[PDB]
Scaffold this active site. Structure first.
Site, PDB file in Angstrom:
ATOM      1  N   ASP B  28       0.742  -1.222  -0.042  1.00  0.00           N
ATOM      2  CA  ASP B  28      -0.124   0.005   0.118  1.00  0.00           C
ATOM      3  C   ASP B  28       0.715   1.269  -0.028  1.00  0.00           C
ATOM      4  OD1 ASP B  28      -2.438   1.769   0.354  1.00  0.00           O
ATOM      5  OD2 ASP B  28      -1.664   1.925   2.505  1.00  0.00           O
ATOM      6  N   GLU B  54       0.937  -2.970  -5.348  1.00  0.00           N
ATOM      7  CA  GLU B  54       0.340  -1.687  -4.908  1.00  0.00           C
ATOM      8  C   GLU B  54       1.476  -0.686  -4.483  1.00  0.00           C
ATOM      9  OE1 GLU B  54      -3.096  -1.931  -2.674  1.00  0.00           O
ATOM     10  OE2 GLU B  54      -3.366   0.417  -2.807  1.00  0.00           O
ATOM     11  N   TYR B 120      -1.312  -8.189  -8.855  1.00  0.00           N
ATOM     12  CA  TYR B 120      -2.128  -7.241  -8.027  1.00  0.00           C
ATOM     13  C   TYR B 120      -3.382  -7.223  -8.952  1.00  0.00           C
ATOM     14  CZ  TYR B 120      -4.109  -2.852  -6.037  1.00  0.00           C
ATOM     15  OH  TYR B 120      -4.757  -1.821  -5.357  1.00  0.00           O
ATOM     16  N   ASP B 159      -2.066 -10.110  -4.189  1.00  0.00           N
ATOM     17  CA  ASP B 159      -3.321  -9.820  -3.862  1.00  0.00           C
ATOM     18  C   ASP B 159      -4.267  -9.971  -4.893  1.00  0.00           C
ATOM     19  OD1 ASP B 159      -5.394  -8.390  -2.685  1.00  0.00           O
ATOM     20  OD2 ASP B 159      -4.616  -6.285  -2.980  1.00  0.00           O
ATOM     21  N   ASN B 161      -7.592  -9.844  -4.578  1.00  0.00           N
ATOM     22  CA  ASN B 161      -8.809  -8.893  -4.346  1.00  0.00           C
ATOM     23  C   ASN B 161      -9.785  -9.934  -4.311  1.00  0.00           C
ATOM     24  OD1 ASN B 161      -8.730  -6.245  -3.673  1.00  0.00           O
ATOM     25  ND2 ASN B 161      -7.353  -5.921  -5.450  1.00  0.00           N
ATOM     26  N   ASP B 232      -4.939 -12.166  -0.073  1.00  0.00           N
ATOM     27  CA  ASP B 232      -3.791 -12.361  -0.409  1.00  0.00           C
ATOM     28  C   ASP B 232      -3.215 -14.015  -0.411  1.00  0.00           C
ATOM     29  OD1 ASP B 232      -3.662  -9.812   1.063  1.00  0.00           O
ATOM     30  OD2 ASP B 232      -2.089  -9.505  -0.702  1.00  0.00           O
ATOM     31  N   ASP B 257      -2.056  -1.912   5.021  1.00  0.00           N
ATOM     32  CA  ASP B 257      -3.437  -2.520   5.478  1.00  0.00           C
ATOM     33  C   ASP B 257      -3.431  -3.924   5.100  1.00  0.00           C
ATOM     34  OD1 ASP B 257      -3.481  -1.655   2.757  1.00  0.00           O
ATOM     35  OD2 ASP B 257      -5.334  -0.565   3.092  1.00  0.00           O
ATOM     36  N   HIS B 258      -2.437  -4.203   4.314  1.00  0.00           N
ATOM     37  CA  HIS B 258      -2.096  -5.893   4.208  1.00  0.00           C
ATOM     38  C   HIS B 258      -1.216  -6.349   5.067  1.00  0.00           C
ATOM     39  CE1 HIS B 258      -4.746  -6.516   0.422  1.00  0.00           C
ATOM     40  NE2 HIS B 258      -4.586  -4.998   0.333  1.00  0.00           N
TER      41      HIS B 258
END
Ligand SMILES: [Cl-]
Ligand SMILES: [Mg+2]
EC number: 3.1.11.2
Lengths: 276, 267
Positions: B28, B54, B120, B159, B161, B232, B257-258
């Site tokens: 992030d 990211e 990603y 990630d 998502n 993830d 935040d991951h």
DNA sequence: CGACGGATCC
DNA sequence: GCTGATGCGC
DNA sequence: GGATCCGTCGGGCGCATCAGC
């Protein structure tokens, strides 16, 4: 006329004792080289840093011998992504470098496995396998473009630290640097274009030829000999492998050696002694 | 309902030791993550391969500390021309490519024994504004991965998502129409597993373990409450399951935040 | 790419 | 799996 | 008429890929 490298001189004429030993070797195929006992010679030379060119060996294929080198435990390898049997360089160091990088600007897309940059405390070490201009000079123009991209790369190092550039630069700079200057001035390694690009390298960066700086008038000192026609026996050779030093490092320079007797490749080792 | 990841199992089912450690982390914002000491955690984890998602950092602005990892000295980066990914490797990869053949989301690194893809995956977005883009991206992705997996064993990390099943996020009921838990996205993930085919390394080893997440919204203290999602993954060719030692969730590493995830393979 | 054949130079 | 032929660059 | 110059030619090495079995 044969050649006998002079004895090793281990103090910078400012009296300081050599503290760093760097050996550079185009091994002409790393796996072949190891079977012909190249590593036994490295152990005897006991360098602090070892740079190899033409490894021609993906990192997964490195012989196990290379892992029982506790005096050279920090090992960095680079091979091109399209040609696993060509090119490839490696850098092996007793001490861990501060930073390591590959290529001369865009290696993540032009994965050529020709250049390794390692930053140590007091200096930056580059080792290079310079692209050959080819039989009949078919790749000479690419070599000229590569040369200029390399010069700009070296110049543009964002370090204040002096530079050590070593490896197979693939040009005999002047006529004294090969046995048959005249019959070779249209052959890869001795074109006006490659000699000029070596000249510009020294001037632009700037850099000094450590060997020639110490032995400016010594002839018949070569580092390469074609396998063909028993050239090595006759010392019909070229000087293609160099240690080039930033100007400041010259008072630290103790010696620049040619290890003519070490077999295992069509190049022989070269060795630098620095007082740092 | 908090979660304690079990210790690392570094031995394969048939007793062979782990030889390969891969760590994937959605940072992030690469620069922020470094400022928040992310590289210090990586140096301790000491993976053979590090995949970042990211990154949001053009190549010319990549921080300097990154070249201070000679243990991950081969570094590859893909920018989107909010996105961006990186792949850092101890060993020199045989080949590295970018993209899926058709945004800075995918790097493909080919190694001796396997091919590594880090991804990603595009978020369907708040209000599902980009769900249709995500659906086309999913299908183009599956098809691209089948081609790869047909030539060599596949490790896919990053990630993705999506939380595949209800166990994979804290609030399944309140998220069935939100990005990352839509029927479409879950369907796409199952299609991904079945079509390629691939196995969810973590769920393969801990099929009944709840509360195991890798993402928590910054807002409303969700990470402190373990209100989060398992976004993830490490997904593997079935062929590689005999090499699987462990698939970890590094719940405690901060900087994003991951949280990081770590795979051990006995190759 | 060094060895070889053939031409050119004084 | 292994060998030798061929291709290619050095 | 020996030394020098210039163009042509055959080829030693390592490694990848392919065929054959
Ligand atoms: Cl390496
Ligand atoms: Mg060579």
């Amino acid at each position: 006329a044969l050649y006998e490298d002079p004895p090793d001189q281990k103090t910078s004429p400012s009296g300081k004792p050599a503290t760093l030993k760097i050996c550079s070797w185009n091994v002409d195929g790393l796996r072949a080289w190891i079977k012909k006992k190249g590593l036994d010679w490295v152990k005897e030379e006991a360098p602090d840093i070892l740079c190899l060119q033409e490894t021609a060996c993906s990192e997964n294929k490195l012989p196990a011998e290379l892992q029982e080198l506790p005096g050279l435990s920090h090992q960095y390898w680079s091979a091109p992504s399209d040609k696993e049997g060509y090119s490839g360089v490696g850098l092996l160091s007793r001490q861990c470098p501060l930073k390591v990088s590959y290529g001369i600007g865009d290696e993540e897309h032009d994965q050529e496995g020709r250049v390794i940059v390692a930053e140590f405390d007091s200096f930056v070490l580059v080792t290079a396998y310079v692209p050959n201009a080819g039989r009949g000079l078919v790749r000479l123009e690419y070599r000229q473009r590569w040369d200029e991209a390399f010069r700009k790369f070296l110049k543009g190092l964002a370090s204040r630290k002096p530079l050590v550039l070593c490896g197979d630069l693939n040009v005999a700079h002047e006529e004294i640097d090969l046995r048959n200057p005249k019959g070779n001035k249209k052959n890869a390694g001795f074109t006006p274009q490659e000699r000029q690009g070596f000249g510009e390298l020294l001037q632009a960066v700037p850099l000094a030829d450590s060997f020639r700086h110490l032995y400016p008038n010594t002839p018949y000192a070569y580092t390469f000999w074609t396998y063909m026609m028993n050239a090595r026996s006759k010392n019909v050779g070229w000087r293609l492998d160099y240690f080039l030093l930033s100007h400041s490092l010259l008072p630290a320079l103790c010696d620049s050696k040619i290890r003519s007797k070490a077999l295992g490749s069509d190049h022989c080792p070269i060795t630098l002694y620095l007082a740092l």
